[PDB]
Amino acid sequence: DKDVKYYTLEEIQKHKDSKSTWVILHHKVYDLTKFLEEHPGGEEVLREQAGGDATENFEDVGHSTDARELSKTYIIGELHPDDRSKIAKPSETL
Numbered sequence: 001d002k003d004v005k006y007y008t009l010e011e012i013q014k015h016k017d018s019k020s021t022w023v024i025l026h027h028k029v030y031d032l033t034k035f036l037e038e039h040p041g042g043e044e045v046l047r048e049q050a051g052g053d054a055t056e057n058f059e060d061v062g063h064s065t066d067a068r069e070l071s072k073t074y075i076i077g078e079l080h081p082d083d084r085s086k087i088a089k090p091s092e093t094l
């Protein structure tokens, strides 16, 4: 069973490698480590950015629709409500 594990942007900008690719697509801590062994196309691309900001590039490829909704299924803990309360309106678009 489980609990929300609200982690800050900073914390998530630590980890990267080693079966732990968490991302801030659209202001939420998304675990891609599961998808590292599932996601269509490849996992290397997932891991490249990892704990950074793999949003713009992801949307550039056209991750809207289905994948965008599925993004929400990788919710393991979300952002810290602190950061998240001040989440500046990012950008754009696709």
Ligand code: HEM
Pocket: 023, 025, 030, 032, 039, 040, 041, 042, 045, 046, 049, 054, 057, 058, 061, 063, 066, 067, 068, 070, 071, 074
């Ligand atoms: C957690 C969010 C993610 C979800 C739910 C997701 C889901 C998907 C899905 C369903 C496809 C196929 C789309 C289609 O067939 O129309 C796809 C393809 C792809 N994804 Fe993701 N993805 C995610 C994150 C990422 C990230 C972070 C990257 C790297 C920036 C990435 C790079 C790619 C690439 C390169 C493809 C292959 C494009 C092709 O089929 O030629 N994805 N993704």
